[model samples]
Target: KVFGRCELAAAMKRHGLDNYRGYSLGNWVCAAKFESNFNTQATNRNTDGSTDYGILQINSRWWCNDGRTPGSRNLCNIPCSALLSSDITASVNCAKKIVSDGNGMNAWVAWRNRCKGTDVQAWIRGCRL
Candidate 1:
């Protein structure tokens, strides 16, 4: 009854979000490849011992206390919680913004170029959505 990374991928694929950015699942897969490698339960330790949560690296202990609210003071709040929503639309929007911010997924365009015509799907086959 619970959804994990793979479920997230399948959900995204079903909702056409895999192609929402005008790219194939390649875009999401590429980001997932670089971000958390699709570790949905993946968590990171902040300098203050705060916990960042989920596959997309959504911080929970600091960001969203309930694992639902979409944060308040911009996307990068101290404990930014907005990143934890079951709403695929919200998650995708956050991801798109993160990618567009030119930090990580900005390199995604290159992913398509480098991974295009190759087995990127299999390359990132183990990744989640």
Candidate 2:
């Protein structure tokens, strides 16, 4: 099932991450809005021969391998299939390394176009608990 706006915000917040110092929970919420709409099973295949998995839309090019993305690096070493679950524990963890190893939130083009310095705080402030 897909998550409500508040639910995703709360769930990802509980993971205690994405607090990558420069980003905030709202930034994640904003990115998720454009990427997955908080859907646990969302999968987007990119034109550049890559696939995005889970809510954060973790890319298979240099992240989790869906076992079908040719040349997938699978940096997280966790199969992309697992990320498509209600429990986003795997997705959150994978996204953690995603930012650390590379792009911060820039890996998600949605983040740059929609989330970067946008009205992100509204996502958190409006969905209080």
Candidate 3:
């Protein structure tokens, strides 16, 4: 369900991240691929599986979307499949703003490390921008 390579490149750019970056998308996708088999809608609620959810695997729900608080349906404002939308630029930018929330690049970096391993070097080359 991903778009063109250029779109993936742009997504990497807007987030100010790099595929080569240690523990970034490459590793995360690799892990997710192994865990969920590249399924964006993948969910493992067996209480034993990982808390991976959605493409990026956001977990436990939080103050996201139109709602001003957690546990509200506003977090579900976007359609389930909208999580797989091809608007990588918009998608990544939106995610960057929400996840960063003025914490700056550090937060995003932390996310990369948590999900992947630790190689924020830009494995995708010049594709991000």
Candidate 4:
């Protein structure tokens, strides 16, 4: 498992996500918190029968295949389990693609409902990037 908020920020910065796609570091931090509670292995099944995997909670319907699901677009071109690993390289890379698709952080429901335009200072409080 990856470390907490501070370490996650460091990892993201190392991956060049300090200001990814015109979004602030705080925006990503806030989204990650609500998406997976800072856990890389987080997963959840949607009511639509699709599953969300990893810290960014990528959707099986579009991002990755879980094998149990049929006709997944698997746009990330990797197994869903790849996002659950301790190493977040695959997850981050896939999230980047999701963002690149013009969705921005809107790809994450948590960002749209909770974090968007809110005060997110605590997500990175005392963390030095």
Candidate 5:
């Protein structure tokens, strides 16, 4: 389902993106905006023979096993289909694992290009989160 910006923020905060791995909730909100526009089912196929899934766009290469990407890491130990669901628990958990790996927010190129070193404070501004 498509979530409003503030609604998504609340969900993310509840799921522990709020200062998870020392990244502010706004940083995650900003990354989500660039990755999926808050759409839970959003997906993108990469040229590297892998697909990104769900709101945070976790990669099949290093995370979920989509069965199509040879040598899939299956790091999150879940099928890619789970990410396509509106239930964001898997998405948030997988994103947490990615961040916990010390990549921080750099795990997502979208975040690096659009959020890092930018005014991410605007992402959470005015939201009653």
Candidate 6:
């Protein structure tokens, strides 16, 4: 969605995500890459029937409502569609809360599976931030 990784990094920093909750910017950026390739409109239906929303790929079961579901925990209290907006402040805020609650980036499976042990610093390699 964004032009380049540097733009994403800069946007994140501007939205107060540079070093949120002790997570390095590289970790956040890396997770975003594997989760939704920085596309705000991204959505995927999981085999469990829950959906993932936005660039962070937040789950519908606990984080937001996909409209078709009822009694969702909806911990973020925002609609799943809100996460898909190009303005990422809501998504970033929700993701920060998820991290704070779940302890690091474990809430995102992509982070654990693809980014956890990788050389994530490369995510910020050419960024001016």
Q: Rate the local accuracy (lDDT) of all candidates.
A: 0.51, 0.83, 0.41, 0.86, 0.90, 0.86
Off by over 4 Å in 3: 2-7, 14-53, 63-77, 102-117, 126-129
> What is the C-alpha lDDT profile of model 3 across 44-128, one tens digit per residue?
4324332334444433343223222234332334533354453433334444444455543333333444534445234344554
The clash tally of candidate 5 reads 0
Q: Write down the worst ten-residue block by lDDT for model 6.
A: 1-10
| Model 1 error, position 18 (Å) | 2.4
For candidate 5, lDDT tens digit of each residue in 1-129? 888888888988998889998998889999989999988899899999999998899999999999999887999999998998877899999999999997789989999999999988888899988
Candidate 1 stretches with Cα past 4 Å from truth are 1-6, 33-41, 47-51, 58-73, 76-79, 85-87, 107-118, 123-129
lDDT of 1 at 91: 51
lDDT of 5: 0.90
What are the per-residue Cα lDDT tens digits for candidate 1 across 31-126? Answer: 554555555544566565455555456444333454343342245433343444454454555555555554554434444455555664664367
Q: Of models 2 and 3, which has the larger lDDT?
A: 2
- Structural similarity to truth (TM-score) of each candidate: 0.48, 0.91, 0.43, 0.93, 0.96, 0.92
Model 5: CA > 4 A from native? none
lDDT of 6 by residue, 1-129 (tens): 553688888788888887798777888899998899988888999877889999899998899977765556799999999999888988999998899895679888899999998898889898887
- Residue 32, model 6, lDDT: 92
Ranking by TM-score: 5, 4, 6, 2, 1, 3
Choose 2 or 6, whichever is better by lDDT: 6
Clashing pairs in 5: none
Per lDDT, the best of the predicted structures is 5
